[PDB]
Design a binder for this molecule. Structure first.
Ligand SMILES: O=P(O)(O)C(O)(Cc1cccc(-c2cccc3c2oc2ccccc23)c1)P(=O)(O)O
Ligand SMILES: O=P(O)(O)C(O)(Cc1cccc(-c2cccc3c2oc2ccccc23)c1)P(=O)(O)O
Ligand SMILES: O=P(O)(O)C(O)(Cc1cccc(-c2cccc3c2oc2ccccc23)c1)P(=O)(O)O
Ligand SMILES: O=P(O)(O)C(O)(Cc1cccc(-c2cccc3c2oc2ccccc23)c1)P(=O)(O)O
Ligand SMILES: [Mg+2]
Ligand SMILES: [Mg+2]
Lengths: 294, 294
């Protein structure tokens, strides 16, 4: 049915058709960090910062969900920020508050039936200030009020870089009360607040690297790196990524290599020896910004 | 001193000089999975399989360590294999036994003062057969006999894909006996058998994906993907990867972007809008084999 759709068709299909294919073939869980906010704004907008990023974020989340992806995991704030200015810190908490209180995004969560969750070490690492305690309350509240939404799940990562200590404490308490260690499923439910399947793909940008989706990484998490920041994500780019993951990463059926002609195995040998030192991930720097070569 | 070495010089330097730079600047911990064994053999060798892969593996580990990398984490066998033939399974255990008993590699561990460790769920997942129980004993034994070696550390991953349940059980036992949860450091020591710093880089090949180094991944783990399988790794490729990680991934000093000319910020804007849909990780398939485009 959907097994032999070509990339050309995939790229031409109506949005609703792509969604049906994804809903059926995956990716079910996609990691999409929001980063490069500052440079995107100053490069593609230069109204108000926080609002521009907020709406742009909604645009992309809307895009991801309308393409049929059930769950999106979005790291948005990592430890690093506590080591930045105080004004920079306040700025962050304001952005955090937006995701949980701003009217336009709350409307978005409702219209697209999105259940929102927060993960990470923010309850411990967020400033003990009034603003910080308010953010935590807002996070807990949004998670509960949107729990009736079932179409999509959105997991925001706030200091969600290393869950080791958190898993340890959760397991100890779980064993104390239950008498047995929690299962993997229960460990995940404890960290994300709900069970979430392993990530099927991660879309980053710039330097090849992944981060902030503990417990959900697998050799099957397809990795992609766009040249431009998260906010630049176009329709075409997303579809080419979805197509690669669905149809190309795990090609079927596979051939019986022991049954290939001498020429085939020879053309293949040449594909590998062609450019003997070819490697993706090595880059060059321009204006302090790293860009992948080749 | 070593801060402004150019790539050209880096590529021309004697091995011993590169090692000194790495020993000083890192990467301290590198992940290098061994995969593509079958296709490498049939493509670049076609004596005996197991021995060819064994010696090739030593060649590469020798290369990695002689370039100054202290610790190499090498996933070598993952769950998948238990779902393959029985002959394929026996073949694996034989390869496993080699890493721990074969004379030439034992000599290698001694000559380069390498402490070897094994991580993963192999104690539980390895066949309860005689061969399986023998492999476990061999693994434990090698870890102890090489513990006096201090120059390098080698961590072999055998079913080391998801440490969640293992961390949970380890934490519960640790709390029982210690009265308090283990620290992150202790959790890592418990999984790898020794403390190991976060991975500074991961070198894979083919499809962009990472796997089997639980707890050691960070946004700072630089990712690289060669076109050809692990065994093809050349001197030039390794140096270009090392250079990128050491000097380019974290460029210093950074510029004051709010202080850049209108043209600079304009050339930059064009670098991002140039090829608006550019993305690394999307590929094409040839003979059932995926190759990254662009
Ligand atoms: O873009 P990101 O938000 O990811 C960040 O790297 C900062 C940054 C990196 C690279 C370029 C820029 C950038 C580019 C063009 C114009 C301006 C930039 O940053 C500022 C600050 C103040 C005025 C203009 C610009 C900012 P961050 O550390 O603030 O997250
Ligand atoms: O500028 P970046 O988002 O790249 C980052 O500096 C984090 C940050 C620092 C200061 C302010 C914000 C911020 C402020 C207002 C709104 C939003 C912010 O970040 C996001 C992400 C997604 C949606 C809205 C906002 C983010 P980073 O740690 O992710 O590099
Ligand atoms: O190369 P890998 O060892 O990673 C593996 O993908 C198998 C494989 C993938 C792609 C190509 C080949 C290959 C290529 C050329 C010749 C032959 C290949 O496999 C066989 C088997 C028997 C005879 C010849 C070849 C093997 P695996 O599942 O056995 O690990
Ligand atoms: O052929 P691959 O090594 O790619 C793999 O099939 C695993 C495997 C299956 C069957 C036999 C072996 C094997 C047998 C003998 C020696 C060695 C083997 O794998 C390695 C890796 C590194 C050094 C020696 C050996 C490995 P994979 O699960 O890693 O894809
Ligand atoms: Mg940033
Ligand atoms: Mg293989």
């Amino acid at each position: 049915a959907m097994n032999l759709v070509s990339e050309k068709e995939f790229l031409d299909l109506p949005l609703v058709s792509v969604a049906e294919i994804v809903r059926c073939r995956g990716p079910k869980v996609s990691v999409f960090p929001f980063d490069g906010t500052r440079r995107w704004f100053h490069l593609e907008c230069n109204d108000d910062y926080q609002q521009a990023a907020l709406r742009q974020s909604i645009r992309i989340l809307k895009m991801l969900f309308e393409h049929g992806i059930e769950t999106v995991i979005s790291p948005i704030f990592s430890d690093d920020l506590l080591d930045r200015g105080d004004r920079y810190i306040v700025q962050a908490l304001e952005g955090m508050a937006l995701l949980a209180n701003d009217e336009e995004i709350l409307s978005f969560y409702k219209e697209h039936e999105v259940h929102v969750l927060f993960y990470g070490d923010y309850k411990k690492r967020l400033p003990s200030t009034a603003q910080g305690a308010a953010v935590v309350k807002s996070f807990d509240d949004l998670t509960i009020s949107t729990s009736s939404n079932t179409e999509h799940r959105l997991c925001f990562g706030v200091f969600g870089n290393d869950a080791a200590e958190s898993v340890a404490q959760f397991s100890i308490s779980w064993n104390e009360t239950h008498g047995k260690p929690p299962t993997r499923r229960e460990i995940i439910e404890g960290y994300y607040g709900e069970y979430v399947d392993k990530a099927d793909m991660f879309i980053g940008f710039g330097r090849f690297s992944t981060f902030d989706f503990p417990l959900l990484s697998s050799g099957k998490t397809s990795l992609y790196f766009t040249v431009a920041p998260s906010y630049y994500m176009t329709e075409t780019t997303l579809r080419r990524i979805l197509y690669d993951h669905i149809y190309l990463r795990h090609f079927r059926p596979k051939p019986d290599y022991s049954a290939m002609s001498a020429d085939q195995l020879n053309v293949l040998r040449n594909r590998y020896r062609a450019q003997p030192d070819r490697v993706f991930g090595v880059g060059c720097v321009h204006d302090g910004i790293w860009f992948a070569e080749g």
